[model samples]
Target: MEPPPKLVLDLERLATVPAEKAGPLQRYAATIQSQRGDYNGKVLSIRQDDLRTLAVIYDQSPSVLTEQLISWGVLDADARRAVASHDEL
Candidate 1:
């Protein structure tokens, strides 16, 4: 069976995304920051559930959000890992 792979975000690329697209994410980041949550300082992996929340907050579909993030160079396509495998972890 096919499953969604892990999605990783490059924190530094946030500075390069267009301002309009970055606004919501910045607010979201601030919220996460205020919560004292733990996250990777650079290559952060975004879980599918959290991505859905962010997509809803951005008023966009998950596919669209994923594509845009990749296009903006914020999402690391090459870093993705298979969600499941026949062999044991």
Candidate 2:
């Protein structure tokens, strides 16, 4: 069978941060945040189906995505705390 198309997450607009600044976890958190209406006014736009697919493909629970992002070094301490706290309730 042919391989599925690799997911291409675009971070071109987020040029303030270096490409290597964040790790997988932070990128993942940013992705979820973008989908969850965090970057609505920004250029990021994640479709619902795409978000669901990513959650499944990554084998991550919706909340765990944030934790992974933290571990991956993509999210800083403040961002990690914020995301975790937001999802706590």
Candidate 3:
């Protein structure tokens, strides 16, 4: 499959979000990682599943989840780009 398009975010602003914002997501990501212990991390679909799950649970758009993840340092710039690149509506 082809790579997703680039999506933009404010790295500077995202860096300033409160530490508490990272707390719950830290465990959530860890839970996701634990569940996929036997799975390959490089797969795009697996990563998408994670992003999708986050979006669903948080009742937010892909852009929001991606931004939150970037702020938390759970996701890197590349992944944020991928997540935000999708349109929720």
Candidate 4:
């Protein structure tokens, strides 16, 4: 199920605050936020799914896709607070 827009935004923004201070998924997002450059083109090319899920669909290992969706909240700052949170989508 999806969450309210405000809650989504809250969780996403919280995502980058740091793993210890943020939600687990948000921490994943945060990891990507600061260091996505390391995975640059790889992440840019796989746009259909989040990094973790993208890995499964793209036949890449878990490590191969970890920074794609990490940029979601930042890139979509003006986007709704939330859409597909419960499913981690």
**RMSD per model, one decimal:** 5.5, 12.5, 6.9, 11.5
Q: What is the alpha-carbon lDDT for the whole of candidate 3? A: 0.52
Better of 1 and 2 by lDDT: 1
Q: Per-residue lDDT of 11-53 in model 2, one digit per residue for the tens?
A: 4434344445334424765767766867533334343245454
Would you estimate the TM-scores of all the predictions?
0.68, 0.31, 0.45, 0.25
What alpha-carbon RMSD in Å does predicted model 4 have with respect to the real structure?
Answer: 11.5
Off by over 4 Å in 3: 1-20, 33-46, 84-89
> Which has the higher TM-score value, candidate number 1 or candidate number 3?
1
Best by TM-score: 1
Query: What's the lDDT of the predicted structure labeled candidate 1?
Result: 0.69
Off by over 4 Å in 4: 1-22, 37-46, 51-89
- Candidate 3 accuracy as TM-score: 0.45
Compared with the true structure, model 2 gives a TM-score of: 0.31
Q: Candidate 4 on 22-43: residue-level lDDT in tens?
A: 4454544445655865333212
User: What RMSD does model 1 have?
Assistant: 5.5
Score candidate 4 by TM-score against the native: 0.25
- Cα deviation at 80, candidate 1, in Å, is 6.5
| For model 4, the run of ten residues with the poorest summed lDDT | 40-49
Q: What is the lDDT of residue 18 in candidate 1?
A: 71
lDDT of 3 by residue, 1-89 (tens): 98664333233333354645544444554566578772523222345545666677668887777766655554566764454446776
